[PDB]
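S.,

Sequence below, as promised.
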Amino acid sequence: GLWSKIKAAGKEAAKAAAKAAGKAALNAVSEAV
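The prediction came back faster than expected:
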């Protein structure tokens, strides 16, 4: 059938921004308190 081509990259793409994004978020408000 097919051995895929862009799977490890995409699976790693979204798996990073989402977390790294909310990261600076907590540090932001947690710094204003």
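Residues 8-33 form one domain.

Coffee later?
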